[PDB]
Amino acid sequence: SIVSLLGIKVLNNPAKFTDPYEFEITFECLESLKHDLEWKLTYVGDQELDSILVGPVPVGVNKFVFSADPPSSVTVILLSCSYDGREFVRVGYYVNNEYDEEELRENPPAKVQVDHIVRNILAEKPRVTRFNIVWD
C-alpha cells in the first residue's frame, strides 16, 4: 500500500445543515505514483457531495483541506479515496441532525425548516475500512 490515511479532522463541527464540510486530511505517500488520488465525500440518507483530485501525488507526509459542498434523523457521510479509480480507503461517520431550539425539537413542523437544522458529526467514532489494490 503506497498511500495511507494518517488522520482526519472534522474542522467545522457542529455546523448548519447547509454549511459545507471542511476536512483536514493527513496522508503519507511512500513512492512516486503515475496517477491521481481522488478524495470523495458521499451523503447517505445516496448522493455524491463533492470530490477533489490530487495529482501528481506528492511523496511524504502531506496535510490538506477538503471543502465539500453541502447536501440538498441520524445519517452517514463516507469519505473515501481512490487511486487511478480504485478505492483503497473509506471512513464513515454517523451524523446527528437536530433542530436549533427546544420547541422545534419537541414540536417539529410538517414542512422541515432546513435553516434551523444543526448537524453534529460524531468525529470520535470513525469507521475505517481499507482495501488492497494494484498501484503501479
Partner: peptide
C-alpha cells in the same frame, strides 16, 4: 475553528 478547537 472555534467549533472544534482545531488550529493551524
Amino acid at each position: 475553528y472555534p467549533s472544534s478547537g482545531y488550529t493551524s
